[PDB]
């Protein structure tokens, strides 16, 4: 089949081509932000052997978590045209940066001006109540500051390593149509 | 007070809001593609 | 079929022709504001190869989010008339600006005068209650200031790059009618 | 068929003939205010080609939104009599002004006198309660000021560009009756 | 107080509200198309 | 079958290749973070005997617990290509570090700035209430600090020993297809 | 006050947020792969 | 106050968090196995 | 205050927490069994 079996746990060095801002909130797993990277190595296989799969696109998804300032990435699919054929398989892999799981960045929040105004209003309200011997503005500003959620920005052009959690057999589009013609 | 974690994106690259009509953007796209092909 | 297979993850440099103001509120995904852009490059494909698809219109949709001051764009369809034929396919792509996902702008809000008046009324009310040894105006002004929602404006004539999340086979209108005549 | 296929995303420069005041409230999408414009260009098509469709009427609908001071327009139908034939198709397009989506104006509100009176009554009530060592008028004036809703006025004679979101095949009335005679 | 994020669109291009009748706009559209065709 | 029976309790010295941050919260067992390690010893078997299985990948899962600053690891599968054959079995093992169960690290928390601000706001509120002869900011900051959860970071390149809790018979892919062809 | 247990990761290796286009990252990936193969 | 029973593990052996890539750990594992076999 | 009935076990014999690897304990068990058989 001119295509080896990509065993479970093989990894390949890559490089990010499309960054994203990781939606890092209590609900980020459902609001994913697509990234993309492109293979620039040789697939390292368990017994010190490889398979030349370079210059190909694999599309991803992203969502960060705040505790560890990392961006968790779940791969989507692959795309390769080595020769006169096409490739489109689904990959259930992930991406690791500098040894650990998920690419890491610096979490970012924007509620500076709104929070400043809300705090100023609250302080003025407290002293105004105290020194007698506004109030309905503060609740509006809180609800306006509560609709953000911290994000982790990931550039485009950093080095990562994709790793295939579950193994699969690489096949081209035509070999996929032919077996689909059987049943 | 202020926010918590750093409140700044570290590469500021915003869009330019100039008021040009659809047809002008179309002509600019023709100019760009024509130059790029050459 | 004189038309290659646009694999998953190919991208093409484009330029925005119709801007929009991104509805950036807790409910913006359902109130989309159409944009449009027009292809001014060559479709970059995974193995360093291309397909001349330039001078064509792809219609979009937009809705911003406030945390990351970006405008998320979900493509709608394509339109091409290379030769004496037509093209109208549906594209499930998106648009990325300057490396990251979604075009970025500067979020904009308009509640300046209304909020100023509401705050003034509240402050006057507080001091009037305090110094005794209006009130029913403030609630009206809050409800008038609470019907806006911040928007991110996007000009027309900025450079972006469309990217196809899922691959598809480009076909003309006539080839679509003929296969539709089979079933 | 002497009529090309108006592909998805073609646009034509036009000019507004009937303005309107955009109902810009939390419920404006259901209370639309008709406008109308008339084609004064040549339909720009994706591959730098055109189709002379000038001097024709396309009827619209309008409703504004307050955040972005624009008036969103959803087309209704077209009307053309090039020659001895008629044309009446339904167009699902929209209208863009100066690059971005929807024509923009300046939002307008009228609650000046009523709000002035309500505020005066409230202030007088507060001081009258305070200095003892009217009230039932204020609620009436609020309910009278709460039945307006800001509107965006659009003149008649400004330049816009209609754009067809979804493509269609232009056909005359007679060709429509004949195919309707088949089934 | 004031709003939060910047309260201004960075390219001001509004519409002109002049009171002209339907027929006058129609005649202007004829003039425009006639000039454009030439 | 050229493959011995890996009895219950055999262990092999390994080395971690992909680290992770252990989700150490009251709900971490369901949000696992994948690791990976690679066999660099000989499988020690109960009666002082071995089986050369070196240079192979075994994929894992992780989740820490806070009381004992350890990261509990539950293996997923194995992958070996000794010769011209493949291996992919499921292993129900675990990993022990320096004698005891689970790799140990140093638990890490990030709520420094947010907690500092919340405490400062509370202290200012208390003294402001006390000395009269803000408040609504504090609850927002608590809810922002309550969405983290301590994590234990594990590097990549530390020495561990995998141990198989339940025994199994090692078999290649082809021997698995053939028996699957019987039924 | 402050947090509890140590509030620091002991190997700081963050990402670089530079604003380069998709095509530029693509050309960099070609350069990297071409060098690596040689 | 403080905790109750002794708050200390009596053999401190933690992990080293050094930032090395997957491939570097792979090469280290090859070096280790090659030395061990000899 | 304190507890009630005597708070002490009258023969203190605890375990030793030394950090040795699995293989080292294995080699110690071989040494022990080999000595015991002789």
Briefly, what is this?
By secondary structure, chain A is α+β, with helices and mostly antiparallel strands. Chain A contains 3 helices and 16 strands. Chain A has helices at 113-130, 135-145, 173-182; strands at residues 5-6, 11-18, 20-23, 36-39, 43-45, 49-51, 57-59, 62-65, 70-73, 77-79, 93-97, 100-101, 103-104, 151-154, 159-164, 168-169.
Could you explain the architecture of this structure?
- Chains B, E, G, H, I: It comes from Salmonella enterica.
- Chains B, E, G, H, I: This is Type IV conjugative transfer system lipoprotein TraV.
- It is classed as membrane protein.
- Keywords: F plasmid, outer-membrane core complex, membrane protein.
- This is part of a larger assembly, with four copies of chain A (183 residues) and five copies of chain B (38 residues).
- Chain A is 21% helix and 32% strand.
- By secondary structure, chain A is an alpha+beta fold.
- In chain A, α1 (113-130) packs antiparallel against α2.
- Chain B is an all-alpha fold.
- Helices cover 42% and strands 0% of the residues of chain B.
- Chain B is built from one helix and no strands.
- In chain B, 26% of the residues are buried.
- Classes of the chains: A alpha+beta (183), B mainly alpha (38).
- At the C-D interface, β3, β7, β10, α1 and α2 of C face β12, α1 and α2 of D.
Layout of strands and helices, then pairs:
This is part of a larger assembly, with four copies of chain A (183 residues) and five copies of chain B (38 residues).
Chain A lengths: L4 E2 L4 E8 L1 E4 L12 E4 L3 E3 L3 E3 L5 E3 L2 E4 L4 E4 L3 E3 L13 E5 L2 E2 L1 E2 L8 H18 L4 H11 L5 E4 L4 E6 L3 E2 L3 H10 L1
Antiparallel strand pairs in A: 1-16, 2-4, 2-15, 3-14, 4-7, 5-6, 7-10, 8-9, 9-13, 11-12, 11-15
Chain B lengths: L21 H16 L1
Organism (chains B, E, G, H, I): Salmonella enterica (Salmonella choleraesuis)
Protein name (chains B, E, G, H, I): Type IV conjugative transfer system lipoprotein TraV
């Amino acid at each position: 089949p001119r295509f080896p079996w990509i065993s479970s746990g093989s990894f390949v060095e890559a490089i990010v081509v499309e960054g994203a801002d990781a939606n890092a909130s209590v609900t980020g797993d459902k609001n994913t932000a697509p990234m993309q990277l492109r293979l620039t190595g040789k697939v390292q296989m368990p017994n010190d052997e490889e398979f030349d799969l370079t210059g190909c696109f694999v599309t991803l998804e992203a969502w960060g978590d705040v505790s560890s300032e990392r961006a968790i990435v779940r791969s989507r699919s692959i795309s390769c045209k080595l020769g006169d054929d096409d490739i489109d398989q689904k990959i259930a892999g992930h991406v690791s940066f500098m040894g650990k799981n998920g690419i890491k960045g610096e979490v970012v929040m924007r509620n500076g001006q709104i929070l400043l105004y809300a705090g100023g209003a609250g302080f003025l309200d407290g002293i105004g109540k105290g020194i007698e011997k506004a109030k309905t503005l503060s609740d509006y500003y809180i609800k306006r500051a509560e609709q953000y959620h911290p994000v982790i920005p990931i550039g485009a052009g950093n080095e990562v390593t994709l790793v295939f959690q579950d193994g699969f057999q690489l096949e081209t589009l035509e070999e996929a149509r032919a077996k689909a013609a059987a049943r | 007070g202020c926010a918590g974690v750093k409140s700044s994106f570290d590469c500021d690259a915003t869009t330019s809001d100039t008021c040009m009509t659809m047809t002008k953007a179309n002509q600019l796209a023709r100019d760009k593609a024509a130059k790029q092909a050459g």
